[PDB]
C-alpha cells in the first residue's frame, strides 16, 4: 500500500526518448531474418 508521493522530480522536462522499458529479456519478433 501506497504512500509517499514524488513527482517533485526537479528538472526541465525532457522529450520522450524511447518506449522500451528499463530491463528487457528474451527476443519478441521473428520476421524471417534481420530487418533494420
Amino acid at each position: 500500500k501506497g504512500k509517499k508521493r514524488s513527482g517533485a522530480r526537479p528538472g526541465r522536462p525532457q522529450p520522450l526518448r524511447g518506449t522500451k522499458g528499463k530491463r528487457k529479456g528474451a527476443r519478441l519478433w521473428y520476421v524471417g531474418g534481420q530487418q533494420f
Binding site: 500500500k1 501506497g2 504512500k3 509517499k4 508521493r5 514524488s6 513527482g7 517533485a8 522530480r9 526537479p10 528538472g11 526541465r12 522536462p13 525532457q14 522529450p15 520522450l16 526518448r17 524511447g18 518506449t19 522500451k20 522499458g21 528499463k22 530491463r23 528487457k24 529479456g25 528474451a26 527476443r27 519478441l28 519478433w29 521473428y30
Partner: protein, 426 residues
C-alpha cells in the same frame, strides 16, 4: 507428442509511452496492465505534467496525485471468475460491458473505444470500485452503473468528479449528523439508568456517522483488521503527490509588452516498488489534478453571521467541548451564498480554520484559478469539483485543462514461455 509443460519466470518488459489529457477535478485512468497470478510487478513512470496555457502569469501551483491500485478479477466477476478458473479451457468466456459509440467515450478507462462498442467488464468495474472506496465522500451513494453507456459525455470522456481539498464548506459533517437525540421519558419521572444507556447508544451512532460509515472502519475500531478481500476493495499499492509549477513567458510586441503567460511544466516520477500479484487482475494507474478551493467571495464566519454572541466570540472551552454540531448556511461564509443551503459544522470550527482572502479587485478577473461564484446546489454538488469553474483560467485548447507525456517503465517477472517456444510446434 510431449508438450512444453513448463516455463521459467523471466523479466517481461511491458514498458509504453502515455500521451494524456484531462479536466481539473476528474479522476482519469492513465495506464493499465493486466497481471497474472504469481507475477511480480514494478513500474517507474517518469514524465512531464503541463496545464493549458494560462491567461496571465502563474499565481498558484496546482497539486497532482498519481495512484496505482490492484484489482483482482475475482473482485469483479465474483463467483463467475472462480468457476472460469476451475472450468479452465472450456470455461464460458467472460462478460463484456457496453460503451457509447464515440472514440472518447471510454477514455475515463484510459482506452480508445473499440468499433464493436464493448470492453472487458473488469476494466469498467475496477474503476467504479476504486472510485467508490477512496474518492466519493463516504456519505454519498456508490456509483452503480451497469455499463459505461449510462454515463454523461463528461464522466465518460474525462473521468468522474472528485471532492475538493477540505474546507469548512468543502468538508462539512455528514448530512444526516443528528443535532439532537430524544429519550422518550415518562410523564413525571425519567429513568436515571435508561438515560445512561441512551448515551451509550448515541455514542455508537455518533461514531458510525463521523468515522465509521464503512464496514472496514467499524472493525478497525474494535482493534481488528480486515483484508481487502473481506470488503472487496481495490488495494492501493502506491501514491505520489506533487505540486506542478513552471515559468512565465514575457510578451514583447507593441501591444503585449507588460503582459505574461504562465507556463506550467512539471517533471514528476511515480514509482511503484515491486509487487507480488497473488491472483490474476489489472493494475490501474490514475491521475487527479486539483487546485486548493480558493473562492473569490468566502467570508470569515465571525465576520459574516450577524451580532456575535458569547458562544461565538469567547473561545470558551467548556462550551465548544459540549454542545451539538452547528447548522450553518452557505450565506454565513459566502457573499452570494444561498441561505437556503445548510451544512453542519463543529462548534468552534471558525477558531480552528482560516479561509484564504482574495481582494474584491480579483473577482471576475480571468486567468486565476479561483472559484467565481459560491457553489450552488445540494451538499454533494458543492463538494464535487466542477471543471468548468476553471474554464476562464486557461487559453482555449484542444487538450483540455492539463496534458502529460509520460514513459511508463514497467517490468513484470512473469512465467509464460518464450515467444518462440510459442511459435515452434516442437
Amino acid at each position: 507428442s510431449n508438450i512444453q509443460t513448463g516455463a521459467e519466470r523471466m523479466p517481461h518488459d511491458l514498458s509504453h509511452l502515455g500521451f494524456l489529457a484531462g479536466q481539473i477535478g476528474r479522476l482519469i485512468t492513465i495506464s493499465t496492465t493486466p497481471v497474472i497470478a504469481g507475477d511480480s510487478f514494478e513500474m517507474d513512470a517518469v514524465g512531464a505534467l503541463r496545464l493549458s496555457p494560462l491567461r496571465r502569469g502563474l499565481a498558484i501551483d496546482s497539486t497532482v496525485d498519481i495512484f496505482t491500485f490492484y484489482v483482482p478479477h475475482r473482485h469483479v466477476y465474483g463467483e463467475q471468475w472462480i468457476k472460469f478458473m476451475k472450468d479452465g479451457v472450456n470455461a464460458t468466456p467472460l462478460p463484456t460491458v457496453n460503451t457509447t459509440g464515440y472514440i472518447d467515450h471510454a477514455a475515463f478507462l484510459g482506452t480508445i473505444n473499440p468499433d464493436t462498442n464493448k470492453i472487458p467488464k473488469h476494466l469498467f468495474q475496477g474503476y467504479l470500485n476504486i472510485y467508490n472506496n477512496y474518492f466519493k465522500a463516504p456519505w454519498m451513494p456508490d456509483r452503480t452503473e451497469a455499463n459505461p453507456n449510462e454515463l454523461n459525455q463528461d464522466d465518460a470522456r474525462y473521468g468522474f468528479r472528485c471532492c475538493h481539498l477540505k474546507n469548512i464548506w468543502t468538508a462539512p459533517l455528514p448530512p444526516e449528523t443528528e443535532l439532537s437525540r430524544q429519550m422518550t421519558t415518562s410523564t413525571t419521572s425519567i429513568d436515571i439508568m435508561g438515560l445512561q444507556a441512551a448515551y451509550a447508544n448515541l455514542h455508537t451512532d455518533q461514531e458510525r456517522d463521523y468515522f465509521m460509515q464503512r464496514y472496514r472502519d467499524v472493525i478497525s475500531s474494535f482493534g481488528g483488521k480486515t483484508s481487502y478481500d473481506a470488503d472487496n476493495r481495490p488495494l492501493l499499492v502506491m501514491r505520489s503527490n506533487l505540486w506542478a509549477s513552471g515559468y512565465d513567458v514575457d510578451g514583447t510586441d507593441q501591444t503585449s509588452l507588460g503582459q505574461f503567460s504562465g507556463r506550467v511544466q512539471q517533471t514528476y516520477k511515480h514509482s511503484v516498488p515491486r509487487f507480488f500479484v497473488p491472483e490474476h487482475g489489472t493494475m490501474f494507474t490514475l491521475a487527479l489534478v486539483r487546485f486548493p478551493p480558493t473562492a473569490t467571495k468566502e467570508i470569515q464566519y465571525l465576520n459574516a453571521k450577524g451580532a456575535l454572541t458569547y458562544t461565538d466570540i469567547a473561545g470558551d472551552p467548556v462550551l465548544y467541548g459540549n454542545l451539538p454540531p452547528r447548522e450553518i448556511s452557505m450565506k454565513d461564509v459566502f457573499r452570494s451564498g444561498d441561505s437556503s443551503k445548510k451544512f453542519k459544522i463543529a462548534e468552534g470550527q471558525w477558531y480552528r480554520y482560516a479561509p484564504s482572502y482574495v481582494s474584491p479587485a480579483y473577482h471576475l478577473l480571468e486567468g486565476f484559478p479561483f472559484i467565481q461564484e459560491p457553489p450552488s446546489g445540494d451538499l454533494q454538488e458543492r463538494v464535487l469539483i466542477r471543471h468548468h469553474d476553471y474554464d476562464q483560467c486557461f487559453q482555449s485548447v484542444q487538450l483540455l485543462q492539463w496534458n502529460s507525456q509520460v514513459k511508463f517503465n514497467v517490468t513484470v517477472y512473469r512465467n509464460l514461455p518464450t515467444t518462440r517456444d510459442s511459435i515452434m510446434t516442437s
